[PDB]
């Protein structure tokens, strides 16, 4: 009683395992060295540490189980009932942690540049540690619906085989559709809005200041850091859109099609696209330390001096 197994080309599977292991080692080393560096203004440090922490947790928790339980053993849950519940709870709590961290960092930069007094009053290390603990608690509360919706179900030929058991939303399609579509709706269309518009008006302020920097009498070799700030700004916004759009387009695709439209080709495309979407979310969670590293070439020096 073995069905629902998807017969893919093994060279594509080996080639995405190699990508997954490369993102694994790069994200773990980058996030480990950034937390050690930030651990050795204070609020943006705790914000970057919280986002890097959430990305390290999404890698070390989600990566090896998703690896072993979708790539190698494609059908059985290795981890049991609480394993499914804890996996989707962690995964979605980390997704809300990452999305709300990038929201908070973009609001903090918009605050830090366009409202300096209001950012002075909104920022205190007591308030920032309370705020990050609040945002981790809110990501856990918004991940409680991935606890109660999800579970085990046996979809064998008669529903009684011990290997026909899968890990699936055990609720009907309308409830599934509303829960997953409000997740993708608020968790993505609100961070795309705040990141895009805030970072756009920051980039406007920085490009006017660059055009007022080309004060050449005052200026040392320090117009590189303003262009680098424009580049890191734009790298943040573009990386967040490109990395967290296909994952929710995939979940939308799971959300709307009621199986009357599914074929074998879209079935196979969905499984390969699932692999690619988890590749992109791990590209996000691994390329945060990269594009915080490479722009701050003195903080980068601090990284490589502590590493050497």
């Amino acid at each position: 009683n073995s069905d629902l197994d998807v017969n893919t080309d093994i060279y594509s599977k080996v080639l995405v395992t190699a990508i997954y292991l490369a993102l694994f080692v790069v994200g773990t080393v980058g996030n480990s060295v950034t937390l050690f560096t930030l651990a050795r203004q204070s609020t943006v440090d705790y914000y970057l540490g919280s986002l890097a922490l959430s990305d390290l947790l999404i890698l070390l928790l989600a990566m090896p189980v998703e690896l072993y339980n979708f790539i190698w053993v494609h059908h059985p849950w290795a981890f049991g009932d609480a394993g499914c519940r804890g996996y989707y709870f962690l995964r979605d709590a980390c997704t809300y942690a990452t999305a709300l961290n990038v929201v908070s960092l973009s609001v903090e930069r918009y605050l830090a540049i366009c409202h300096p007094f209001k950012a002075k009053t909104l920022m205190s290390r007591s308030r920032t540690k309370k705020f990050i603990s609040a945002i981790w608690l809110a990501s856990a509360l918004l991940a409680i619906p991935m606890l109660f919706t999800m579970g085990l179900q046996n979809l064998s030929g008669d529903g009684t085989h011990p290997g026909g058991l899968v890990c699936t939303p055990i609720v009907d399609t309308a409830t599934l559709k509303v829960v997953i579509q409000v997740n993708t709706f608020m968790s993505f269309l609100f961070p795309m809005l705040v990141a895009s518009i805030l970072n756009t008006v920051i980039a406007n302020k920085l490009t006017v200041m660059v055009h007022q920097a080309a004060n050449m009498t005052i200026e040392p070799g320090r117009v590189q850091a303003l262009r680098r700030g424009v580049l890191v700004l734009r790298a943040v916004v573009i990386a967040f859109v490109v990395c967290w759009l296909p994952y929710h387009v995939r979940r939308l695709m799971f959300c709307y099609i009621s199986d009357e439209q599914w074929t074998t080709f879209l079935f196979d495309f969905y499984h390969y696209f699932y692999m690619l979407t988890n590749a992109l979310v791990y590209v996000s969670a691994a390329i945060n330390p990269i594009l915080y590293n490479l722009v701050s070439a003195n903080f980068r020096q601090v990284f490589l001096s502590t590493l050497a």
């Binding site: 629902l4 998807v6 979708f70 999800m150 179900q153 979809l155 899968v166 890990c167 699936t168 939303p169 979940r251 799971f254 199986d259 599914w262 074929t263 074998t264 079935f267 969905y270 499984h271 699932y274």
Partner: peptide, 6 residues
């Protein structure tokens, strides 16, 4: 044929 994958 519905994928259970999510």
């Amino acid at each position: 044929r519905r994928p259970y994958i999510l």
